[PDB]
Design a protein around this ligand. Structure first.
Ligand SMILES: *[C@@H]1O[C@H](CO)[C@@H](O[C@@H]2O[C@H](CO)[C@@H](O[C@@H]3O[C@H](CO[C@H]4O[C@H](CO)[C@@H](O)[C@H](O[C@H]5O[C@H](CO)[C@@H](O)[C@H](O)[C@@H]5O[C@H]5O[C@H](CO)[C@@H](O)[C@H](O)[C@@H]5O)[C@@H]4O)[C@@H](O)[C@H](O)[C@@H]3O)[C@H](O)[C@H]2NC(C)=O)[C@H](O)[C@H]1NC(C)=O
Ligand SMILES: *[C@@H]1O[C@H](CO)[C@@H](O[C@@H]2O[C@H](CO)[C@@H](O)[C@H](O)[C@H]2NC(C)=O)[C@H](O)[C@H]1NC(C)=O
Ligand SMILES: *[C@@H]1O[C@H](CO)[C@@H](O[C@@H]2O[C@H](CO)[C@@H](O)[C@H](O)[C@H]2NC(C)=O)[C@H](O)[C@H]1NC(C)=O
Ligand SMILES: CCCCCCCCCCCCCC(=O)OC[C@@H](O)COP(=O)(O)O
Ligand SMILES: [Ca+2]
Ligand SMILES: [K+]
Ligand code: NA
Ligand SMILES: [Zn+2]
Ligand SMILES: [Zn+2]
Length: 782
């Protein structure tokens, strides 16, 4: 029980924690119905609006007014933000020429630059092109500070998952806020954007910035604002807090606007009606900047202007209904819209038939505007599976569409789609002494920002999914010096030790400076305990695992001119034992011969052999991996057609390929115990995915093997599945569907590192920070 009889006199937006029975006056009291009886009266004044006018200048102080224009207002820290312009002949900040801020220019008593996070909801990256004609304050921040052309949100691209990802550096599957709405089967409770359940702390995992700050003795302003508090009051509050005594002043502040999201939903992102909302946000940024200038802080504070996601054209006319595919939709609950998550209406309903549901949802219309996935089958780049609140059955919805349960307008915009979709991209600008001046940086992911905000505040980040150092290039100072991870397992280098006669594997082969060329960036470091051999070959090198009975990685270079050679008919089934590696640490062809479902393939493709001679190396048992025929359709097309196409287009390519084991879909290398499938009658483990990392010279005029500067990389993590049900056109020639599949399963090198325990690019001519940026790159194909 809270005693509302108390008073917020001299307590408005106090920062001290106050629990029952005492009543509160903080920004969040209204949400807890714990405000004192005079909160709204004392703390939420509106009298005379938010702007000084000439007739108010040097007024006598009336405490009833929203903000003040009296002579004392400055030292009391509560002038209207435009007070000096109107009353003292100063200029608005926006009208001042930009000037490099080489070091913080902070008043007496400031030990470090404060950080202000200005978050805007549904701010599509492309809105920035509207420029100073619509958003002059924001355009000044953008042009004079550090900006990216866009920032990638996390999936699903909705507000709660993204704001909490911004605060924690975590994927939703890790922080727990996996949607704006979710059901937790253990709590047997439901979380909604609106309603009180979300206030319960059990939902929120990881360690958000305000807690990290507090635990390290850095004070934080509020990172929540009650919907009922006007933006102007939020801004005045921040400025008032910045005017507090040195021993009370917070170091980090957050402002949030629910625009332009609201207007985007109503009108769509290209509506002329979007101009007004964007002007209003800009006016708010100007209030803040004018306010800071009034306080002599405008060259002291670091400002981050950042969105949570974008906005797409989505109308009533573009809605798929499950009732068109399924007989009884009244027995399922659907989290609907720009994504789908399906569970039985009655929790744990035993008659729930997921395999039958998925079958009825797979490739049933030619123009079908969604695709069902069991969550372990979603592209690994989404990192959307390892949480009990994520339903097994997911629908990935096509951009511009909605999915609804049944048929049983006022909206022209929505968001939530796949986070590589252009319309979902959002904004990032950093401005202030710690950011660079007039600098553009490539797009990056929002999971990276937590580390950077920690850097900006002198904090040590809690464990998270950013790659610390990958954004060092945004900063003038306060960069993080990353350290190379230490290798855990050194390789063996086996020479010949056996005779062809030593081998009884069931394999038949009818007819009978490698590094320099093939490990352009050094051998990958193995970061776990295991046993593996380096193997050299004319055309490729590999780290062959004696535990998993196949390479952890296979590395090879293909020059622009390389010749694609066929596999001779007599070599079709050719598999040759490898006299460097024990029969006991080898696969055997008998397992394949007998497994009626599983075939095999090669990591180094015989099609790219450097001579009919060398091609015999490609058929070694130590180059072979278990592949379903369905997967082989993809992999052969890749090996035979695509690698050469890339070599041709990029002036040669360096390729590293290998298996991934992630049976528990946690995005991390499986230990032996977690692997759940083996080739029939054997102990050959079956990968859940195969990866390829394709590197070349950023300057395409230089060949990959003779690159002097920055690198270019694209990579994939392809699902190893027994059918091609994912690809609706797979009945056609591979040229009609394989690349489309591959694009959906594009990945970062960093993703592959998590999934393999390998560390790549350890020997290059670039800085470690640059390499970290390279490893976080995602080739989107948009
Ligand atoms: C993205 O970055 C994160 C953070 O580093 C990585 O997530 C970590 O993975 C490691 C290795 O698997 C886990 O280690 C285990 O920790 C548990 C004990 O963990 C408890 O205590 C820690 C520390 O206080 C706490 O962070 C954990 O929080 C988890 O569980 C909470 C209660 O259910 C929950 O509220 C919170 O959201 C979080 O859930 C997530 O993780 C759990 C697994 O712990 C997972 O089941 C769930 O679905 C969510 O994904 C927890 O209270 C030990 O007992 C084990 O032995 C082992 O040490 C970390 O727990 C985990 N950290 C977090 C915060 O998720 C990701 O791997 C990384 N992803 C990628 C792809 O790189
Ligand atoms: C709820 O808060 C009110 C206001 O603080 C408390 O009222 C005070 O109670 C004391 C006696 O306990 C009186 O001497 C004061 O005059 C009261 N203040 C006013 C202005 O009313 C009240 O006690 C609280 N209720 C509780 C403690 O249950
Ligand atoms: C999957 O779709 C098929 C239709 O293609 C559904 O088949 C119907 O099944 C009902 C009872 O199950 C029969 O009365 C109808 O004759 C079938 N319809 C047609 C047009 O053939 C099937 O029910 C669907 N399954 C699920 C789980 O929704
Ligand atoms: C690094 C700090 C990051 C976080 C700053 C957080 C500020 C939070 C203020 C409280 C939450 C406001 C949430 C909100 O107002 O949602 C509005 C909804 O219509 C959004 O729905 P949707 O995703 O657009 O469909
Ligand atoms: Ca795993
Ligand atoms: K077979
Ligand atoms: Na198919
Ligand atoms: Zn939002
Ligand atoms: Zn929205």
């Amino acid at each position: 029980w809270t005693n509302t009889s108390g008073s917020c006199k001299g307590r408005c937006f106090e920062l001290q924690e106050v629990g029952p029975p005492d009543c509160r006056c903080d920004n969040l009291c209204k949400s807890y119905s714990s405000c004192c009886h005079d909160f709204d009266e004392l703390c939420l004044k509106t009298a005379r609006g938010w702007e000084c006018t000439k007739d108010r200048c040097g007024e006598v102080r009336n405490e009833e007014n929203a903000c003040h224009c009296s002579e004392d207002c400055l030292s009391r820290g509560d002038c209207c933000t435009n007070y000096q312009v109107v009353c003292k002949g100063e200029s608005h900040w926006v009208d001042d020429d930009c000037e490099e801020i080489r070091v913080p220019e902070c008043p007496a008593g400031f030990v470090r630059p404060p950080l202000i996070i200005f978050s805007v909801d549904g701010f599509r990256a492309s809105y920035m092109k509207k420029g100073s004609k619509v958003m002059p304050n924001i355009e000044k921040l953008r042009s004079c500070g550090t900006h990216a052309p866009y920032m990638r949100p996390v999936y699903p691209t909705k507000t709660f998952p993204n704001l909490y990802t911004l605060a924690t550096g975590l994927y939703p599957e890790s922080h727990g806020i996996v949607g704006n709405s979710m059901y937790d089967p253990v709590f047997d409770a439901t979380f909604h954007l609106r309603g009180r359940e979300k206030f319960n702390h059990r939902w929120w995992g990881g360690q958000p910035l305000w807690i990290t700050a507090t635990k390290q003795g850095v004070r934080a302003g509020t990172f929540f604002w009650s919907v009922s508090i006007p933006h102007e009051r939020r801004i005045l509050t921040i400025l008032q807090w910045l005017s507090l005594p040195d021993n009370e002043r917070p170091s980090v502040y957050a402002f949030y606007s629910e625009q332009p999201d609201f207007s985007g939903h109503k009108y769509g992102p290209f509506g002329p009606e979007m101009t007004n909302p964007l002007r209003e946000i800009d006016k708010t940024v100007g209030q803040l900047m004018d306010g800071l200038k009034q306080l002599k802080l405008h060259r002291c504070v670091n400002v981050i202007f950042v969105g949570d996601h974008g906005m797409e054209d989505v109308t009533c006319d573009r809605t798929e209904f499950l009732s068109n595919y399924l007989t009884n939709v009244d027995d399922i609950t659907l989290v609907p819209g720009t994504l789908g998550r399906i569970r039985p209406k009655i929790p744990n309903n035993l008659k729930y038939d997921p395999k039958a549901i998925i079958a009825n949802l797979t490739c049933k219309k030619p123009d079908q505007h969604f695709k069902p996935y069991m969550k372990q089958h979603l592209p690994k780049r989404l990192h959307y599976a390892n949480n009990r609140r994520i339903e097994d059955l997911h629908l990935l919805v096509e951009r511009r569409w909605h999915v609804a349960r049944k048929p049983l307008c006022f909206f022209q915009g929505d968001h939530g789609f796949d986070n590589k979709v252009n319309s979902m991209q959002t904004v990032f600008v950093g401005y202030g002494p710690t950011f660079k001046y007039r600098t553009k940086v490539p797009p990056f992911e929002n999971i990276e920002l937590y580390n950077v905000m920690c850097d900006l505040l002198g904090l040590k980040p809690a464990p998270n999914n950013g790659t610390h150092g990958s954004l060092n290039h945004l900063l003038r100072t306060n960069t993080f010096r990353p350290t190379l991870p230490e290798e855990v397992s050194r390789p063996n280098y086996p020479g010949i030790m056996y005779l062809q006669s030593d081998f009884d594997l069931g394999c038949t082969c009818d007819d009978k400076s490698t590094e320099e060329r093939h490990l352009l960036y050094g051998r990958p470091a193995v970061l776990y305990r295991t046993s593996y051999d380096i193997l050299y070959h004319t055309d490729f090198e590999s780290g062959y695992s004696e535990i998993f009975l196949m390479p952890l990685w296979t590395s090879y270079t293909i020059s622009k001119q390389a010749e694609v050679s066929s596999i001779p008919e007599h070599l079709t089934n050719c598999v040759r034992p490898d006299v460097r590696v024990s029969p006991g640490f080898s696969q055997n062809c008998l397992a394949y011969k007998n497994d009626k479902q599983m075939s095999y393939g090669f990591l180094f493709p015989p099609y790219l052999s450097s001579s009919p001679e060398a091609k015999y190396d490609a058929f070694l048992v130590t180059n072979m991996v278990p592949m379903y025929p369905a997967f082989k359709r993809v992999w052969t097309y890749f090996q035979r057609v695509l690698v050469k196409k890339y070599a041709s287009e990029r002036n040669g390519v360096n390729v590293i390929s290998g298996p991934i084991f992630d049976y528990n879909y946690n995005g991390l290398r499986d230990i032996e115990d977690e692997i759940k499938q083996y080739v029939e009658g054997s102990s050959i483990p079956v990968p859940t995915h195969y990866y390829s990392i394709i590197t070349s010279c950023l300057d395409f005029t230089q060949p990959a093997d003779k690159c002097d500067g920055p690198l270019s990389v694209s990579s994939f993590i392809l699902p190893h599945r027994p059918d091609n049900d994912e690809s609706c056109n797979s009945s056609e020639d591979e040229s009609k569907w394989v690349e489309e599949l591959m694009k959906m399963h594009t990945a970062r090198v960093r993703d592959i590192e998590h999934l393999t325990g390998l560390d790549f690019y350890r020997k290059t001519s670039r800085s470690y920070s640059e390499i970290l940026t390279l490893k976080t790159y995602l080739h989107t194909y948009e």
